[PDB]
Write a protein that binds this ligand. Structure first.
Ligand SMILES: CC(=O)N[C@@H]([C@@H](O)[C@H](O)[C@H](O)CO)[C@@H](O)C[C@@H](O)C(=O)O
Ligand SMILES: CC(=O)N[C@@H]([C@@H](O)[C@H](O)[C@H](O)CO)[C@@H](O)C[C@@H](O)C(=O)O
Ligand SMILES: CC(=O)N[C@@H]([C@@H](O)[C@H](O)[C@H](O)CO)[C@@H](O)C[C@@H](O)C(=O)O
Ligand SMILES: CC(=O)N[C@@H]([C@@H](O)[C@H](O)[C@H](O)CO)[C@@H](O)C[C@@H](O)C(=O)O
Lengths: 288, 288, 288, 288
């Protein structure tokens, strides 16, 4: 398959006021990422796409729209994990039939599942689809557990989201050919200093230019320039996080002419006047 | 409004080896709770029912089967919570149409929702279905937030799950006409000492006789008697938790002639010979 | 030798403005507890005593004063734990030589000690003094471990401080002859419903009368009455907590005529005008 | 003014079997660090020196010995924090009188202090001693709280111990002239990539040559090479942690001819045969 290293925006989805998918808006978000953010790929169906608040058919529709819009221009990873393994299988087959390059799957949540159940979960998704897989968990999983998961050759690596840099170094050390995508945009530099292979992030939807610079500069050992860019990026992320992550990134998109729509409920769907004013301010100070 | 105080078993569901619902087996679990455990009602669709691993259609099927088998012999509570509000509303409406007495919904999880989002979530389920509601959250939410939720008159009260007895006392003190259902079977006695109105539990599917005793004796001031029965119950409960909660209760049901079937994947579906043997010893010592 | 069951106030200490011990003030606190609060005993040098911010010599003067003031009128428990085992041994020996009825010692903190190191710590303080010992830890320690500590016959039981009501029933059940003192004043009722033998608490310095009531009514099966007294008590305790525990209890003692002094720095030593006014309102509402 | 940047070993202390300080041994640990590890300085009285298990007189003796042994060959920081603010003041004055370059102090612990209290503790220690200060806390306190601490111009910066690399970047961006010393030896590389000014660590007592290489190689933008040294360091560090941190580093020193003696009880004072064997193996693998 296609190279999966580098910069992947975790695709946001545009919703209408009633919560249905705004396909036109979604296509516009995709074009912005490919054409203007210059990403190496998209991670579709992740937490950033408001995946877990949608139906199975809704997830399928975004997968179809995203593939139809990006075609073969960029690499595409489909996040298909769920507490429902049958639905994870159904989505992984559908993504696979569409041509996604790889699957990703959150470890099953809500219940406290044991390691063997988690490993069976990933092995089943793999077996039923025939696709390669990128694992990840929500608030960890240690070196011994990664070794067991990595006994399946179709597990390519991990979307690392917890801020434990000793565990990140140990994983690269113990499983050096397995890939690591950093999931924390605001800690890209230190992640890249430990050799991650790429990054999957929500802020790359509007700050992809600087994210690629931090990455590439840090890999070149150009730390002082990389750090200046990480500092500006972090002022941007700090405002986005204080203002409302999802709504603020969609408002920033709308200021570039992307109809990024509303958020899906149970999330607050419409930005307040003050959230809107703050997004304009962030745009002015950092994306102008 | 049918009386909702008392002992409610959180209904377990029987699954075939392929993970599909075993309707015969589910009807036998329901008959055992009504006729042998003699519970006041069933809490259908909860975490004990393996609910969050299933599709919307399988959730509806379980609600169909449970209402058909129980008719109006006992009170029925439908748990319809989800990260997907549209699905919660759709499930709330179907359960309301089937004739469930009340609805229950877990606070939306996975994402970190704010309090207003959480209240908007419960207010929407109620307004779209017109039914009463029992709130609850997984791993708190304080007196001020419960008061806000209680501004909606259809919010009857809470299924209390975190072992914070100071908060339990405060909530009963502050809102004396709202109801509380203890969710921790092994802490029934102390909860009943602070005035809870009932209990919703997984172990009542096999230990409903003793659960009622502890509750009734504690409410009456017969503390010595209640505590001896809570001790024996906690010995059983300690063995069920060490042996595997879900499979053990199903193995205990099969020793009573109920086809409780398999667990649903991602959960470990089949009990090991060691787990079957331990269920047989627990049956012999505690439920014979 | 002497009975250790019942109500123990965790002795508060009076300090002057410069942080030195106000002996006259302390003796008055002791007098209020024995004569008005009618406690079965005092737990001296506990965290309520501002113990961990003082020197070894200051800890010794508090143990000399309390024993000289209380004489043989009430049971006395000396808390002598520390991160410094040589200090713990020194205090234990002194308290033993002053005539305290029993010792108590927090598990060594700061560092993460292993179970065996913790058992060796209690065993050493016992070996060096020959006194009975009441264990406790700050924020758990399970049944197995309590059984290991209880192999030493001088370990009488535990001052239970963590809100785990399931562990509390398991402990009492596994070791029916070992004693349990509830450390949480606001959860006295549910603790007494599971058979605890007494309580050690800071609010007994001002609410001693209602505390015995709750306890004695609850061991008597008069749960409706106990619950009411626990409700009023918890209104007082909530107000104490919100206003600042240590200074609020000292302001309340000052309202009875006890020179309870200032708090020792690094805690804020002096109450503000609002704290004093709130103490007065709590005097009027609950202790007049 | 003595430059405080760079590599600081957190000095280990040699104890006799009875727990008293082994002066000869301690001076051999000091000489090894100056002469063999080539550290820029020592951080004396830290948790690595087993400080919190000792008496105030013992702490003072350690300060006297380290300063008499190191003279002015290196920088010296004295950690004098305590839950006892008068003890903190007393220790700070003594260290200042001995010529220590700077003081450092843990946030007071055991109790839950407010921020105002914590700032008052630091201001008092400073005001009473006349010395500069390096703050630190145990397991976070944000940007806004470090700004308030830094209103006191004698607070030089922080010994950063929590693995939050976002906060670390934020701190350096908000107070670019204040210093940061990384406290996690296993994450030196990522910390140096964000511009920390130095590092304080326990493993530099045996791994000082590599620690300096990582630090200096990372500042030079030689990330590939720094990473390889961080990788072997971390295999050593992983083995030290698994085998018992303090005892393994002391056992490692003993194989270098340093009488590092025993640990101080409540910590296990003597290494077992297995711990001795594992230190010899770690010595052969990484430090020969
Ligand atoms: C929890 C979360 O939102 N994580 C983001 C980060 O990009 C995050 O948004 C960003 O670092 C701000 O904290 C991505 O890792 C999530 C991405 O992996 C996804 O599944 O959508
Ligand atoms: C997480 C969990 O298992 N909770 C159980 C308890 O009955 C629990 O099984 C029992 O106390 C054993 O710990 C119920 O509260 C869950 C019940 O409310 C449900 O929603 O299914
Ligand atoms: C941490 C704490 O303050 N606990 C108090 C409680 O009485 C407490 O003050 C009360 O329950 C209010 O929360 C006592 O248990 C402490 C007491 O055992 C002591 O050692 O002084
Ligand atoms: C908690 C702890 O042991 N921290 C060490 C680290 O060097 C640690 O030993 C090392 O990173 C291994 O985890 C030092 O930061 C402690 C040092 O700051 C001290 O105060 O002695």
């Amino acid at each position: 398959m296609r190279d999966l290293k580098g910069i992947f925006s975790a695709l946001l989805v545009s919703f209408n006021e009633d919560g249905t998918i705004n396909e036109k808006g979604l296509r516009q978000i995709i074009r912005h990422n490919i054409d203007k953010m210059k990403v190496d790929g998209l991670y579709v169906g992740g937490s950033t796409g408001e995946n877990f608040m949608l139906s199975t058919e809704e997830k399928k529709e975004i997968f179809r729209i995203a593939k139809d819009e990006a075609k073969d221009q960029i690499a595409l990873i489909a996040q298909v994990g769920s507490v429902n393994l049958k639905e994870a299988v159904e989505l992984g087959k559908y993504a696979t039939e569409l041509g996604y390059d790889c699957l990703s799957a959150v470890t099953p949540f809500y219940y406290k599942f044991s390691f063997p159940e988690i490993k069976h979960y990933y092995d089943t998704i793999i077996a039923e689809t025939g696709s390669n897989m990128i694992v990840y968990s929500i608030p960890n999983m240690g070196i011994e557990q990664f070794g067991e998961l990595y006994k399946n050759p179709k597990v390519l690596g991990v979307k690392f989201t917890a801020g434990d840099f000793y565990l990140l170094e140990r994983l690269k050390k113990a499983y050096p050919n397995h890939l690591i995508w950093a999931g924390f945009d605001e800690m890209m530099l230190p992640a890249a200093s430990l050799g991650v292979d790429g990054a999957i992030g929500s802020t790359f939807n509007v700050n992809g230019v600087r994210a690629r610079q931090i990455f590439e500069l840090t890999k070149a050992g150009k730390l002082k320039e990389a750090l200046e860019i990480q500092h500006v990026t972090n002022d941007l992320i700090e405002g986005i996080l204080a203002n409302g992550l999802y709504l603020t990134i969609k408002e920033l998109l709308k200021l570039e002419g992307v109809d990024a729509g509303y958020c899906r409920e149970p999330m607050t769907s419409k930005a307040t006047a003050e959230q809107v004013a703050k997004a304009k301010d962030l745009k002015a100070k950092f994306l102008s």
